[PDB]
């Protein structure tokens, strides 16, 4: 049939031939049947979701087969043929729970290349498929081999720098999508979706299966599964709750420095610097005269546009200011 | 008028992309107010007529310049000798005046001046700098143009290596150009070129200092110093505190901004902000005399620049308070005197 | 009378142009090394007594590897590798856990912490700061600050970069050790001397100072200051703060410190601190019984160390409250015991 995706990767394996990591230069969403046909026989692809290793020699064949069908992929395989490191071609018939490390990595590539958006792809059971790895200046290094390599570097007056020890590498070591800034790339995980015109500042962080439509200024934390709409700004040190109700931020929102949200934010919401709006926070909802409409749980204001959340600096009450009348607010609360 | 006495000059080695756009320039020994002797020796070889200039120059010219400066400035001469061997492209940037920058090379020089501490935040004209500072991939092999990156990432992978991309931004990190004396910076990813880190300052891991910002020194920085924010002598910014971006926010001498707190106003000398409190410009504050009685309720904004304030949030009634050691008459004078 | 040592380790390190030690790396540090090891090794090193950082030669390295052949295979193998080294070697033999007296020793004690051979507060780190020189931590390793500018220039001349990722007295831990069963998202944020317990994951916003850390397991996404130890199964939410240092702050077992919150007191077991709340020691808290009636207004300091407390700020009246599943009578007894 029509495949969901395919990509030709170069990766790394440990001493026991386990896959630590795979890099895909040119992943494809819904590749053309012409490409799949030409490639399927050579790789030994029958059906379903497969991570198929292949050889330098098979690389040259595949390069030739795709000459004249897709120039881009052919030139990639031609480079892949000179590779010292092992090769995998992962071909996915369906968008399903991943079954291999190679597939898990491809699906995170699809997100970070912006082929698919957060929540558009199945990442169920990915965690056991992503091995904990030492991310170093020489690449991924298995934790069982690391101490030895660290010693040998020191003997030569050198340093094996270990900049991360984790199941997810940092995105920019695999892709930097167009029209994006990321001040400290240590803080954006492979699998993050950084929309065009987004700038993630130093205090900003974006988990996998999360990100920004773009444009936007991210200076706080976007947790797994959180997606931030168009033109929204997250101030320095702000928090977006993780972990059911998914957290999102709408369009044109402003989340203040050091503040936080545990509810989904509707469009053009503002949260005061320093304010943490928890799902069960009891909020004094105010109409456009700043008169109490009623006290509600923050959870119940989820998705409503044009709210300003603030903590009253004289009586300590968390207040939600609107430009709507009481009868309007009550209507919104019940539909 | 004829050729002047310059604002700055520096000999730099930088990096260009395939279309010869400058990504980046490194100046080892930048000069504030260089002597007329240095300029007179160098100008004819560089072809510097007047004003503010980013003049590319050759290896041969580098030797010529080293010779001309021999016996005028030993340091500069020696640098030019080294520069003459370089593989990378050279630029001499001579600025007659401190004006809005007109080139990437000039932009980079002005950020160096700040980070070498030759000038302080706000003393230098940085207007319109963003469009001169191209977005670049800062990698372990240096600056790399974004259109050239994906290719280079592939080639490293094919050799079993990694092209590490530690930052994608218009500003590189300062310490890849300068580490000024008497300074600690725990995670250097968090101090931009253009930051001024004063002697005896320590920037901890959670600390951050933008361009055109920083510390007099000494001090402990563990929160975020936004662009244009200067922190006096002996002031401490607690872990994860915030200073608001952008009128001008500053911090006086001897302040303590609590962990996870924040300021949207200039804090006068010896102010204290309680851990967890965000003092917003429009925050309504209970100003209290000694004896802790209410003087009026003011906007935090009207307390800007006042010394010896303690800011706190009453833990029993939620009121943001400013405690003072002053009478109602004293406070009246401090807030309203002409 | 020569003793039975607190610690010993063979290190390879880096010196500046004035032969001052910037840094030492210990591959396999020993806690309470056997008398058999100390006896084979001491005459070659010239160890006499006490706490000693003893430099040694490549030839001495071979001798030591030969002496420990058939006593401790691992140490012998290490010494054989050290014999090939281009960098200078030191053997640090510590008779006692005492205030450190050398850069070599200060580094060993932090190694002991990070290998998890000892726990935070179990080791004497008194006066350590003067022993740990401020160093530029680069991609080529430790560099003296007086030599750095020159090396920065030379890299630029070759179109390369001398990356300078930290300028500090403490390097990052993972450049020395990655202990088993641990995840650290951004390793710039865990210092040598951190104790990161098995099953701990330190996310990107997490930070752990020296002489601090986690029993394990747990999720650390906030700041663990020096001298702060966090019990089994406790979660520190994103950007939470743990006050620095005379009450020593600690977090008990099974606690939840919310995102952007903070503690200036020790937290007893199974405590919860609402997201965004900072609880300082002088913070006045409304202590509520299992029926949510006011029992008493107390300073948070006096609730420190009690189990099963939920700290929250009342979103309607601004009062910092502490909720419990105990009666007024049980609570008053705890405040008076
Ligand atoms: C919440 C926020 C948006 C409100 O500011 P605002 O409404 O735009 O501007 P103002 O301060 O003029 O608001 C008007 C009134 O609210 C009052 N006010 C503001 N915050 C208050 C509070 N927490 N409690 C009581 N009154 C408050 C002001 O004093 C003023 O009173 P007035 O009507 O008697 O003049 C702002 O204070 C804030 O927190 N912004 C966050 C920005 C940020 O953190 N990051 C962006 C990138 S740095
Ligand atoms: C704001 C701060 C300075 C107040 O503490 P302080 O003035 O040093 O000393 P205390 O805590 O003893 O204050 C004295 C009184 O005020 C009370 N108090 C303190 N904070 C209060 C609050 N927020 N609401 C009501 N009462 C409070 C104390 O209970 C005590 O009451 P008492 O007069 O009945 O005995 C402090 O709590 C703080 O937040 N410091 C920030 C440090 C930090 O975050 N980082 C530094 C880097 S390690
Ligand atoms: C404080 C906290 C623990 C309370 O949550 P909870 O008790 O488990 O769940 P609930 O929301 O049902 O709380 C129960 C009651 O408290 C109320 N409540 C919660 N916070 C309140 C507040 N600050 N002021 C007043 N009421 C509050 C709820 O409305 C609810 O009221 P009800 O009994 O009238 O229906 C939670 O809000 C919190 O801060 N969690 C921190 C988690 C975090 O930041 N990170 C975890 C790692 S991702």
Numbering used by the authors:
A (entry chain C): 3 to 245, 251 to 342
B (entry chain A): 0 to 245, 252 to 343
C (entry chain B): 1 to 245, 251 to 342
Please share excerpts from the published article on this structure.
Pseudomonas aeruginosa is an opportunistic pathogen that causes persistent infections in humans. Randomized transposon mutagenesis screens had indicated several genes from the diaminopimelate (DAP) biosynthetic pathway to lysine in P. aeruginosa as essential, suggesting the corresponding gene products as potential targets for new antibacterial drugs. Dihydrodipicolinate synthase (DapA) catalyzes the first committed step of the DAP pathway, the condensation of L-aspartate-semialdehyde and pyruvate to 4-hydroxy-2,3,4,5-tetrahydro-L,L-dipicolinic acid, which is non-enzymatically dehydrated to yield L-2,3-diydrodipicolinate. Tetrahydrodipicolinate N-succinyltransferase (DapD) catalyses the transfer of the succinyl moiety of succinyl-CoA to the α-amino group of tetrahydrodipicolinate, the first committed step in the succinylase branch of the DAP biosynthesis pathway present in most Gram-negative bacteria and mycobacteria.
The structure of PaDapD was determined by x-ray crystallography in its apo-form to 2.95 Å and in complex with coenzyme A and succinate to 2.3 Å resolution in the spacegroup P41212. Coenzyme A is bound in this narrow cleft formed at the interface of two adjacent subunits. CoA binds parallel to the trimer axis with the adenosine moiety positioned between the C-terminal domains of adjacent subunits. The pantetheine arm lies in the groove along the β-helix of two central domains and the β-mercaptoethylamine moiety is facing a cavity where the succinate molecule is bound. Binding of CoA to PaDapD does not induce any large conformational changes such as large scale domain re-arrangements as indicated by the r.m.s.d. value upon superposition of the subunits from the apo- and CoA complex of 0.55 Å. However CoA binding causes a disorder-order transition in the enzyme. In all structures of PaDapD that lack bound CoA, the last 15 residues including an α-helix, are not resolved in the electron density, whereas they are well defined in the PaDapD-CoA complex. The crystal structure of the complex also contains a succinate molecule bound next to the acceptor arm of the CoA in the active site cleft, most likely due to the presence of 0.4 M succinate in the crystallization buffer. Bound succinate interacts with residues from both chains that make up the active site. The position of the bound succinate corresponds well to the site of the succinyl-moiety in the ternary complexes of MtDapD and EcDapD with the co-substrate succinyl-CoA or its analogue, succinamide-CoA.
